[PDB]
Amino acid sequence: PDHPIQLVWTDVNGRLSLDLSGAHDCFLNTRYSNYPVFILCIIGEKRRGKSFLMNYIMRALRSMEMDEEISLGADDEPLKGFKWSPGTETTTKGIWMWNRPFLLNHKGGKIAVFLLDTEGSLDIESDRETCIKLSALSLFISSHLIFNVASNLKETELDYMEMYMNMGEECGPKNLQHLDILVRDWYHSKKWDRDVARSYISREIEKLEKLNSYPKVLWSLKSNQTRCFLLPHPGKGITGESEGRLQDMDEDFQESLRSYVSKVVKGICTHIKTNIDGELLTSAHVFSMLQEFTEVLNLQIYGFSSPMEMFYAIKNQKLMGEIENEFQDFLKNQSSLTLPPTMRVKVSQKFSELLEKFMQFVQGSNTSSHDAMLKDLEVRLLEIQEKFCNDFTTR
Numbered sequence: 001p002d003h004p005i006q007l008v009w010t011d012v013n014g015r016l017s018l019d020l021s022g023a024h025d026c027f028l029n030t031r032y033s034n035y036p037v038f039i040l041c042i043i044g045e046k047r048r049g050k051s052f053l054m055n056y057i058m059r060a061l062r063s064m065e066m067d068e069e070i071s072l073g074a075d076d077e078p079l080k081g082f083k084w085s086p087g088t089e090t091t092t093k094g095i096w097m098w099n100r101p102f103l104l105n106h107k108g109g110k111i112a113v114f115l116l117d118t119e120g121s122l123d124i125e126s127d128r129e130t131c132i133k134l135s136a137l138s139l140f141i142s143s144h145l146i147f148n149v150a151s152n153l154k155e156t157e158l159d160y161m162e163m164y165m166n167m168g169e170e171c172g173p174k175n176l177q178h179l180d181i182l183v184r185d186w187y188h189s190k191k192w193d194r195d196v197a198r199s200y201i202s203r204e205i206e207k208l209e210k211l212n213s214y215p216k217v218l219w220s221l222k223s224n225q226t227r228c229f230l231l232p233h234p235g236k237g238i239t240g241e242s243e244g245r246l247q248d249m250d251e252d253f254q255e256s257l258r259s260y261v262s263k264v265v266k267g268i269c270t271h272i273k274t275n276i277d278g279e280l281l282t283s284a285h286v287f288s289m290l291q292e293f294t295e296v297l298n299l300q301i302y303g304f305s306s307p308m309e310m311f312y313a314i315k316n317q318k319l320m321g322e323i324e325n326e327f328q329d330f331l332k333n334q335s336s337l338t339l340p341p342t343m344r345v346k347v348s349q350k351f352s353e354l355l356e357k358f359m360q361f362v363q364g365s366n367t368s369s370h371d372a373m374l375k376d377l378e379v380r381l382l383e384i385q386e387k388f389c390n391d392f393t394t395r
């Protein structure tokens with residue numbers, strides 16, 4: 001009985017918890033463990049139709065799995081999410097996924113398509129750091145991210161997008177992070193004009209070019225790497241009480257949804273992701289990356305206010321560890337027969353140089369986190385230095 005499963009939740013203390021058994025049963029089944037995997041994620045504001053679009057994309061994927069044509073019936077009831085929220089039930093917040101993948105055919109192989117809904121993100125101020133960490137975990141394992149927006153792009157959303165752009169830099173050789181900005185309720189009827197979409201795009205690109213911020217999303221927009229899709233209002237047949245049927249939809253919304261679902265489920269085969277090793281990603285790889293990035297986020301104890309800031313904090317904590325190891329190795333190379341005075345001079349100078357190197361290689365502009373990291377690095381290197389010297393006493 002295929003059902004939705006909650007993969008990652010946020011504990012009361014802010015730690016990110018993972019369903020190890022569920023992720024093992026989903027990503028490591030012997031059937032599709034080595035099939036190339038494709039994770040589709042929907043991030044956006046609540047009550048905007050993310051689960052609805054995911055359910056229709058799911059029906060299209062079922063059609064593709066059984067035969068070869070994308071079809072959706074005119075009177076069929078929904079499945080998963082809210083469009084088919086269980087009679088008298090609703091949903092929780094976190095990362096949710098479809099327990100069973102969808103196997104498609106591409107150039108002699110089977111692609112395992114996983115559907116990931118991020119019910120709960122883009123908060124106003126309700127536990128901001130934890131929401132950032134959850135959405136970052138989602139964006140880390142995603143091969144195609146659909147950002148469900150409701151108007152012009154907001155700073156929060158643009159920062160999330162820049163983070164998604166940056167979180168694929170060491171995930172493959174020439175990895176292109178594919179992003180689909182889905183604007184909801186942008187127009188009513190009016191059929192469609194290819195003018196409204198490129199007008200939205202022109203507005204956004206002007207805003208970003210003046211911002212001198214969010215540069216990589218700006219490049220992706222001006223390079224047609226990230227694509228924007230603007231569908232009309234669903235109509236009162238979907239809003240409120242409804243069984244999410246296409247007979248309950250506006251025909252313009254129906255056709256726009258069909259076009260978008262075609263876009264999304266027909267570009268999977270043409271955009272498989274490669275890892276740094278040069279191989280294609282599989283579901284077991286995704287399980288491993290899930291665990292690894294969950295623990296990486298649970299260990300980011302420094303402060304941040306934006307997604308990009310948490311990205312830079314991850315990187316700078318890694319820099320801290322690298323400098324610690326460099327100092328320890330420098331001390332390991334030092335002889336036990338060196339002149340103690342010149343030895344203390346040398347070690348103090350390595351201390352100073354490593355601190356300056358941290359300062360020159362730090363990333364981001366949050367000088368507060370920079371100072372905190374430098375202070376803690378100073379304390380650790382001081383411990384290392386005094387330890388080496390203390391042992392040098394008895395020698």
Ligand SMILES: Nc1nc2c(ncn2[C@@H]2O[C@H](COP(=O)(O)OP(=O)(O)O)[C@@H](O)[C@H]2O)c(=O)[nH]1
Binds near residue numbers: 044048052119234239
């Ligand atoms: N305004 C609007 N509502 C929609 C759209 N698609 C679905 N809805 C409705 O908005 C409600 C919330 O849907 P939901 O799937 O739960 O969105 P989600 O919470 O972000 O995942 C549902 O009852 C849908 O029927 C849309 O394109 N625009």
